Amino acid sequence: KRYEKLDFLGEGQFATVYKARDKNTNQIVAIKKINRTALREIKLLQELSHPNIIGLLDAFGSNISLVFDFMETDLEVIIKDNSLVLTPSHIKAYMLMTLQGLEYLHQHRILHRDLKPNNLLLDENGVLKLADFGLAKSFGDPNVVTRWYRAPELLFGARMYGVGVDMWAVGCILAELLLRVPFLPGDSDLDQLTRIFETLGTPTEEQWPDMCSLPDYVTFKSFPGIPLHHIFSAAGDDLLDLIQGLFLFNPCARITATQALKMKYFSNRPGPTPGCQLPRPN
Numbered sequence: 001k002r003y004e005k006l007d008f009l010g011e012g013q014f015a016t017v018y019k020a021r022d023k024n025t026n027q028i029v030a031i032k033k034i035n036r037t038a039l040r041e042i043k044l045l046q047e048l049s050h051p052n053i054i055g056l057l058d059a060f061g062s063n064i065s066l067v068f069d070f071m072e073t074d075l076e077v078i079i080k081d082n083s084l085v086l087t088p089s090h091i092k093a094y095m096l097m098t099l100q101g102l103e104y105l106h107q108h109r110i111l112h113r114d115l116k117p118n119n120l121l122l123d124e125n126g127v128l129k130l131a132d133f134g135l136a137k138s139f140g141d142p143n144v145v146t147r148w149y150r151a152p153e154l155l156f157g158a159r160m161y162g163v164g165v166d167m168w169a170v171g172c173i174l175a176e177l178l179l180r181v182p183f184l185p186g187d188s189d190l191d192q193l194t195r196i197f198e199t200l201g202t203p204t205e206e207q208w209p210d211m212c213s214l215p216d217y218v219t220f221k222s223f224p225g226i227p228l229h230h231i232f233s234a235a236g237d238d239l240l241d242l243i244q245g246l247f248l249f250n251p252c253a254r255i256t257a258t259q260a261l262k263m264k265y266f267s268n269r270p271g272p273t274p275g276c277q278l279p280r281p282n
């Protein structure tokens with residue numbers, strides 16, 4: 001075979017994943033040995049080419065094997081690792097790679113729909129790539145991330161939706177970088193809306209006009225919500241406005257990947273850390 005099977009990387013409800021060596025270029029890779037979460041990581045990734053999106057390098061039959069770039073670490077590992085402190089500049093660099101990847105996705109009319117820390121992968125040189133495109137779909141296709149990163153429209157059972165689903169998840173990732181714990185850990189779908197509205201305030205028909213006409217909208221307790229300078233007490237105003245923009249309840253008011261990258265936080269000092277100096281676990 002083409003590959004030298006090095007390590008077992010893990011098992012899910014799709015695939016057995018493996019570290020391996022490409023036996024003719026000596027390049028280290030990752031192989032996803034596995035229908036519809038499989039045929040639509042190929043349909044999308046052999047198409048796409050962006051530094052901050054995982055590359056599909058080869059594939060074959062009888063189980064399907066899918067050969068991506070090997071990444072040493074991921075953002076969940078960095079978050080969990082106590083030896084690493086995250087300076088403002090490391091966070092800006094993680095956010096800037098994550099947003100430049102999604103802005104190209106959203107410009108190619110694709111929703112990732114599964115953004116979590118553990119799908120933001122990180123190669124030895126500190127390039128963040130988005131991975132796990134098995135829940136991704138085109139803006140066009142007719143009709144949903146893990147509960148903690150899930151937008152309130154989806155929790156009120158919205159049937160059509162867009163960019164905002166991925167942008168809410170990015171905000172939850174930014175909060176977890178800054179707080180180093182999950183921002184909104186709901187134990188259920190209803191608890192998830194309880195925590196959202198207890199943290200950010202129970203919205204109105206002004207904050208969110210068609211909210212009362214969502215398929216699963218239900219009258220929640222009013223909560224004032226905590227101000228974002230209390231939760232993110234070390235964050236500057238430039239960063240507090242990025243957060244405020246990604247956590248707006250109205251999905252169309254909610255800031256896009258392009259509007260996020262046009263915010264002053266990304267041109268303000270301190271600019272993002274070089275890839276090669278981003279913190280490294282062992």
Ligand SMILES: CC1(C)CC[C@H](Nc2ncc(C(F)(F)F)c(-c3c[nH]c4c(P(C)(C)=O)c(C#N)ccc34)n2)CN1
Nearest residue numbers: 009010011012015017030068069070071072073074131
């Ligand atoms: C704990 C670490 C840091 C160790 C290295 C691993 N490096 C890596 N590089 C590329 C890929 C990719 F994306 F290219 F395959 C993957 C990968 C993607 N989905 C995976 C899964 P699942 C089945 C949860 O989707 C499992 C399981 N089990 C295991 C690995 C992956 N991992 C990332 N995490």
